[PDB]
Design a protein around this ligand. Structure first.
Ligand code: ZVR
Ligand code: ZVR
Ligand code: PLP
Ligand code: PLP
Ligand code: PLP
Ligand code: PLP
Lengths: 452, 454, 452, 454
């Protein structure tokens, strides 16, 4: 045994599963707003010998020795991170060791807050993320709601926009130590200047969680939260199109000096994490280099055009969009007017190789959602353009109409799901649409390796 | 732009760094006990298209669709995990989504404990890990000590072994809800039976953190913690020789029929409580390594790890070196350098300059910035087909670096003067260059798992 | 030494101080809304041999023996407590061991909540009490804000009333485990039914802290919070006219059964307190017996008439009242229109033997307050009637006019305070008013002993 | 209605209860170590018009006006407190507003600690108080254990004394921020010097809870905790023979000039953090009792308390009774009844039925519902002019009740059968009535501090 045998020869069962997933991605219309297709260059670093290096600590401050190369790799990733977002190294530092987006947020809370200190994020059914402090009326769900005390702020259901006025009102009463400006299902630009004013009034840190829009921020196609935020967290995948990892940007210099650097770094290690994933760090550095190129600005501009073309196409077919439209990479469809819910439509679309996720509309109470979240980054990476996304909406409309007919023939949601598989005419009607969807999607190029 | 260009074509700066690190790993004598060299098969899965799939939730209960293949991969990783450690699926479950070893431990505490509940683990200078509850005398270090109340149990300074009697005494007073039986720097086997007895008396959970010895447990070359522990966490790298990830094993079934209530709490703590989207590429790489851990090849590898560790221990004893707890019974050796005139901080930088990677280790000592001895591991070089004689020559190379450090200590004052002379003195740098020359020449001859150039 | 010597002979220095304070109470116009004059009957029990009995535990469940009499005294106090507020013993229990009003509230929180569980009370400058969870923008002040997580609710500054709508809005976001319906400076009746609806919606306990209005509740001159609250706390002094102690009323029976009794009792002892103060318990029982008499209903009715007469008199002199008037025992005067603040007026009134306390008006930001809280219970106990309180307002008006003239001759507040003592003409003008105030007050009877 | 009618005229039911309790106190032999009989001078201040004054805040910094007289009373109580324990006002301050002993302790924890900070006190069955951090094995009992993390230190079961060595060992591991040197059932003197050394090593606050021995410390008949402790809490009753209230003494001044930071934190925790309006009537009654504690009369009283406690201990030893820790050095005796055939639960109910009030006490035992022996105190009866011979007759009365209980145990099964036969058996109830007859006849002859009929 040498450890140099290929996966194809060593583990054929796992190699086959890799090919099955690769085929599923190539043949499907990927519309999950948080999904992207990572480049082969980054994947080559993700699966590299850098997995074999324990480098606990930070460049120059390592527990072990023999870290001279991974120090260069981590320092280069930091430089490329600051360059990708046009940041002055005298004003901004960055930690590239968070294992993912969720560990990045937990590191910020651990760094800047005491246990049970107060946090305000956008409510989960309103578009906020778990790590912004979600707990139901029955249970603390996110650990951010366990180790810290969270209170959400809400959208204005009439406009579908963040209610910045109610946030200001409630933050004055709740007195949060940190407020999160960042979303998972929000089609509009965040008023970071207004978030900053609220934070300054109540003496709270402003954290910008730009995970969904980080690639758009780097390409300078939407306003940057770095002009207003004290801390900026993000995933390294999603619109950044990198390997799965996290980043913590923090201000340094004159605030009285900023005191984020040492607290943020200490929270990541040794407080929360162990050995860094240097293979992910390198793959992140490869992606950040790509994010600085004119290619990536063209890609991010096309992401905006494709999302607007998808929004326009849906509006012409008689669909309603939460907040009327979109200013970023995703679209929030409200399907309740058309007579279908997000749970039924998401299941029908999934069976025809169209991946979307149901989304709560401002009307419901988190109640099967009557909405759908659609994203452009993944297919735009496959060189989809405006006309291609209009064709995507055509396929979506067929799936919705199939779900409408099954709804008239079924009662509960489980009867709906079972009817899509047991009924013969519905089965073949879905099979025909699935086949037409996959031939269309297979023709587009796919980033990454050929077989896996 | 297609995203299919090679890394060497599209980013030569990063490709050069990848090759330099690969050349550093190939030419060096890796002796860090927590290090290993991942197989190429697992690395091909680690850098795969599985990075492009959000599968929040668990098989059969995802939040998105399109998870049909990653559900098979996650379920296969679970089955391969239960098989690798010879567990009945009716009595044991496993979560394969922890991002690393530290997230695996924090998920267990979040699943089973309320904030500020009490935790007992081996102290960090005594061989424990950070995530077992390490807080100093001026600040709380690990988040284990922030979100929960931790009190350490210590070694017996006369024997170098865990003081199970003092642990039993202090556990009756501290009343912990969870005790961690797991180590980061400990050369002997843990009495999990005595650990279970202490936990059963104070009515605390027994968590086994076998991250350092997971490969040895899977190959059944050392006693398994699963016979006494309710929860077992581990890394997927180190002795398991996989990609960097974590695992949480938990008891299932009957503890009328009073059932175990670990599964739903453990899974919920991992997601949605603590983590976001799983790293499906790591999960597949773990499943590749877990399959290898079931083969007779892996049993022979872990057996060689044990013999190499004892051969390194005996080769050290026969050259005037003291060993904490006398010797070893697992994969590492805790060498005590103070009955030699040198410390762990001085020796590790000398060894690092001759391509020999080790880490300083606190011995059962006086100061802390100059810890006692070193921690040396077997699994890394054993994966490079190292035999007993090969490690005896490694000890030969170590002893030569030890003597160079002892001579530099004679010409230098404090630590900074010691390290500065290693790079500034002409005769010293040339003497280090020669030893590094023969160490690298000796290490390159051995094979290396993974790819060829990266 | 026998321990039977009188205080007059044993400690003349302390006996003189007792007489000095007694004279100060007899000669002063006591307008602090939380003050009353305890009867001699209750004071006789307060300073009795019951101080010499350690009775940790509860009637029948004592740690020690020889508690047969104090068990009868504690059980009688409970029966008189339930009778005073017209409570069915099958529906209500009562703990008579809280050392004061603040220990009573802390016992309820400890009994029903976990550390850092959420609490909503009226903001302190809005009329709420410390023990309802007060913390400034700089510091956790009340231990209720330290061991538990509090968020206040506010008055509507346009009306001076509790903003029940904003409470409902914010309670839905804050998700409190307990909401406090009770005030220290509020001249209106609390909508306990609306508080109950908010609590039922968010699954919170409704605690009614009736300390200021307990005597009014017992006499049935204002609506009772026992019709809507799960728990009711109160002081035993103030409008109840007893010794200083506390009470915790709790529902028992069918809620599914109520589980307040064992948790409340365990929280008082052994969790929080030690040995009960049986001398206070007996003095409380004496007061509760008085609260059941037709005399006490006449007293409480006169308290309402006197407060309304004081409010009407102030309105006729051109004063403004927060919320327009009063429905209970106190009046909230807003002095900012007259050109004087509460801090200046309270100091001038104090020097002429008129005891009031400055009070924040809904306009200020907690800024020397421009308001005054005036209370009727204390002087009503001295047989003050409507015309007597109109004479009190006459004296108050003179003091305000003195403060207005000193304000025109001084700059800072410290210059104002110093001018009232150093300036000769201001000194004698205050001395004349003080003399006229004290002759008027001395003529009225005073509950308690003659000399002390 | 004037509010000036007498209690006997306006509430005869309550007046009768007051007289019955006064008659019970006069006719009984009060042996509870925490009990005492307050002087009439203090009771006249306790039930005074000072109940009618809200004085939230502190002298010179009140929230209301009209506090000119209560400011003098509170300041005089402070001066009398500092004088009673012979403290330099430049080095010690005192808060006289705690409602009782338990509020005084909670105020110190709130002032000096964050929630869930660590606290070490003597375990409750070992002689500690609830407010020192008592939590059982199934639930947290005292709020000390809820809002803060407490770990108990234990007695040496072979000597009955505090195991200062095990306390030093466990304090290095638990790392408490505050250690309480104070007891509720402990017959020996506390080594505050050893307590300060342990606190100085682990860098924890040393709080002395002298509530049981405050009168003995003021009269300088036992060593004072103020020489070693930074904070000292106490009740104002018990040995101090005052009204029920509490005190918090704290170090002031210089610990450049690094000052003590106790005063502002302690005062703020009492008000506005924890308490509302002070009980000015209790504060004045405390000042009356604190003045008495400075007189040579009180020194002779505390000396008699010590001799009466040792006379009661010797009278017990000479009748076949074992004493925890061998004997006593303060005001109480810890009698161990198991080398006699009876338990504390059975003896205390027999003694209670003959007007002899004691309490069961856990001895260094097997069970808990039937604790070992009893706790007997001297200060109560010593205030009734009891001499050494008087307590030797008290032991005579106790021993007679002990023997009646031993005979009832021979005819009964468990505890409920024991207590039921004491009231149901004709010969037993008549034998108890005779002993009660002579106990009450012997106790009534002695004077009683306070009023005559209430
Ligand atoms: N706007 C927005 N859109 C999206 C789309 C994807 N995500 C990321 C995950 C979303 C999420 C996570 C956990 C729960 C959750 O808690 N589920 C169960 C627990 C299971 C159990 O009980 O077994 C519960 O409710 O308890 C949830 F309902 C939803 C987001 C997001 O975060 N925000
Ligand atoms: N409506 C209403 N009216 C009244 C009238 C009397 N009271 C009862 C006490 C009121 C109160 C208590 C504490 C603070 C307070 O915190 N002060 C200082 C601390 C001192 C320091 O710093 O040394 C601070 O602000 O820190 C306060 F400003 C006010 C109330 C009430 O409770 N409510
Ligand atoms: C390695 C190890 C950890 C941490 O693993 P990471 O992958 O670095 O998070 C924790 N505990 C033990 C016992 C370990 O051996
Ligand atoms: C994606 C996302 C996260 C979590 O990222 P993971 O890599 O899944 O941990 C957190 N917050 C926001 C706003 C996100 O978009
Ligand atoms: C008496 C005592 C207490 C409690 O006193 P209370 O007045 O009952 O609150 C606390 N600690 C010690 C050491 C005591 O002796
Ligand atoms: C008076 C009052 C308190 C506190 O009473 P104290 O006896 O001073 O502790 C608490 N809450 C309210 C509403 C009060 O009126």
């Amino acid at each position: 045994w040498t450890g140099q045998e290929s996966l194809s020869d060593s583990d054929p069962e796992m190699w086959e599963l890799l090919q099955r997933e690769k085929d599923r991605q190539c043949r499907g219309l990927e519309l999950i707003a948080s999904e992207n297709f990572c480049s082969r260059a980054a994947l080559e670093a993700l699966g590299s010998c850098l997995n074999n290096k324990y480098s606990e600590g930070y460049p120059g401050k390592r527990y072990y020795g023999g870290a001279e190369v991974v120090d260069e790799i981590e320092l280069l990733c930091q430089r490329r991170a600051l360059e990708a977002f046009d940041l002055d190294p005298a004003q901004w530092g960055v930690n590239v060791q968070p294992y993912s987006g969720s560990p990045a947020n937990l590191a910020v809370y651990t760094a800047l807050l005491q246990p049970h200190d107060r946090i305000m994020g956008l409510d989960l059914p309103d578009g906020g993320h778990l790590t912004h402090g979600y707990m139901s009326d029955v249970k603390r769900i996110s650990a951010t709601s366990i180790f810290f005390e969270s209170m959400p702020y809400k959208l204005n259901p009439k406009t579908g926009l963040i209610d910045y006025n109610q946030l200001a009102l409630t933050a004055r009463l709740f007195r949060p130590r940190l407020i999160i400006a960042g979303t998972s299902a929000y089609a509009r630009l965040i008023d970071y200047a207004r978030m900053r004013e609220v934070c300054d009034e109540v003496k709270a840190h402003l954290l910008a969680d730009m995970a969904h829009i980080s690639g758009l921020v780097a390409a300078k196609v939407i306003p940057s939260p770095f002009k207003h935020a004290d801390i900026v967290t993000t995933t390294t995948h999603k619109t950044l199109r990198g390997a799965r990892s996290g980043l913590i940007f923090y201000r340094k210099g004159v605030k009285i000096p900023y005191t984020f650097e040492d607290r943020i770094n200490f929270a990541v290690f040794p407080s929360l994490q162990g050995g860094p994933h240097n293979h992910a760090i390198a793959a992140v550095a490869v992606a950040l280099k790509q994010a600085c190129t004119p290619m990536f600005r063209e890609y991010s501009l096309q992401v905006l055009k494709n999302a607007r073309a998808m929004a326009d196409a849906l509006l012409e077919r008689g669909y309603s969009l939460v907040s009327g439209g979109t200013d970023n990479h995703l679209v929030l469809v409200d399907l309740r007017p058309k007579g279908l819910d997000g749970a039924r439509a998401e299941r029908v679309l999934e069976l025809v190789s169209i991946t979307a996720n149901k989304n709560t509309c401002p009307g419901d109470r988190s109640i099967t959602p009557g909405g759908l979240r659609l994203g452009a980054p993944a297919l735009t990476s496959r060189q989809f353009r405006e006309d291609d996304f209009r064709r995507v909406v055509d396929f979506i409309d067929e799936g919705v109409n199939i779900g409408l007919e099954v709804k008239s023939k079924t009662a509960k949601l489980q009867d709906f799901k079972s009817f899509l598989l047991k009924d013969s005419e519905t089965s073949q009607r879905l099979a025909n649409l699935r086949q037409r969807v996959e031939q269309f999607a297979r023709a587009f190029p796919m980033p990454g390796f050929d077989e896996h």
